[PDB]
Amino acid sequence: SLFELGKMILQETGKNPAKSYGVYGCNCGVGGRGKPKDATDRCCYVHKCCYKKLTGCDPKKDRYSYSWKDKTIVCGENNSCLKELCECDKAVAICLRENLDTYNKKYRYNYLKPFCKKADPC
Amino acid sequence: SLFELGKMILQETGKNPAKSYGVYGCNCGVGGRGKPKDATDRCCYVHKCCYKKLTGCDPKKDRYSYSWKDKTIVCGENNSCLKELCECDKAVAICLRENLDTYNKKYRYNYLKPFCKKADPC
Ligand SMILES: O=C(/C=C/c1ccc(O)c(O)c1)O[C@H](Cc1ccc(O)c(O)c1)C(=O)O
């Protein structure tokens, strides 16, 4: 669910996840996908495509548990949606961390998301 | 389309429409609906429910014709759906104008949109 996703992003990036990514670029947070502005945005693009692969899951509401082993996220749920959502969320939190150095606050509150150029199909 | 809506909002409110309303509250701009935060937001809630009622046209994409003369909006009726779409947009622009007095900049970039409480079904 959103709560787990936010926590993973917070735990991997150290940033306030909704504030920093909730409206970032053409793909992060609210709304859909669009041409990525940068690497951080591409992380979010990939994340939304990851969600789209799933059938019958609710990425916003479906709560799952995850744990830490050796400072790495462990997705141990047996429920297929919960496992897959967890893996999508883990991947985007890692990707956002990996690309932290090019985070650009200019993109943080993108009130022009609806005018983003159309994303390529997932 | 978003172009006519933005034009009406700028005509009626004098505000940069995407900057002022593109991420405002739980209902304005990008994203879906949610419990309205204030009167401006409630304008946006009603607007998105208006869009949901339409049949036969696409509120994001489809252009339509209206006139702005003597600071009054008149919607064209060459197409019945575009007429209704135009009326949705006209109503939100007026509603936003009339609630500018309680516009709250703290709600302008609502990066917590996905955590809005469930909106009233339309
Ligand atoms: O706790 C909530 C929301 C709870 C909630 C309430 C209704 C919903 O429909 C829903 O999906 C969630 O709001 C925020 C939570 C929050 C999450 C991630 C952040 O990065 C943050 O700054 C705040 C707050 O503390 O003000």
Residue numbers in the entry:
A (entry chain B), B (entry chain A): 1 to 13, 15 to 53, 57 to 61, 67 to 90, 92 to 123, 125 to 133
Give me lines lifted from the publication on this model:
Interestingly, myotoxin-II (MjTX-II) isolated from Bothrops moojeni venom presents some structural differences compared to other PLA2-like proteins from the Bothrops genus. The changes in its amino acid sequence, including mutations in conserved residues (Leu32Gly and His121Tyr) and the insertion of an Asn residue at position 120, are reflected in structural changes in the hydrophobic channel and its interactions with long-chain molecules. Furthermore, fatty acids binding to MjTX-II are not necessary for the alignment of its MDoS and MDiS regions; consequently, this difference is important compared to other PLA2-like toxins, since MjTX-II activation would be facilitated.
The MjTX-II/RA crystal diffracted up to 1.60 Å and belonged to the P212121 space group. The refinement converged to an Rcryst of 15.7% (Rfree = 19.1%) with one RA molecule located close to the MDiS and helix 1 from monomer A and 392 water molecules. Similar to the PrTX-I/RA complex, the crystal structure of the MjTX-II/RA complex revealed an inhibitor molecule interacting with the toxin; however, RA interacts with both monomers simultaneously and in a different region of MjTX-II. The first benzene ring region of the RA molecule (derived from the diphenyl-lactic acid portion) interacts with the N-terminus of monomer B (Asn17, Pro18 and Ala19 residues). The second benzene ring region of the RA molecule (derived from the caffeic acid portion) interacts with residues of the C-terminal region of monomer A (Leu122, Phe126 and Cys127 residues), which includes the MDiS region. Several functional/structural studies with PLA2-like toxins and ligands (e.g., aristolochic and chicoric acids, suramin and Zn2+ ions)17,19,23,39 have demonstrated that their binding to the MDiS region is associated with the inhibition of these myotoxins, such as that observed in the crystal structure and functional data of the MjTX-II/RA complex presented here. However, the RA effect on the MjTX-II quaternary structure results in its disturbance, forcing the toxin into a distorted conformation, evidenced by the increase of its radius of gyration (Rg) from 20.0 to 21.8 Å and COMdisp of 31.5 Å.
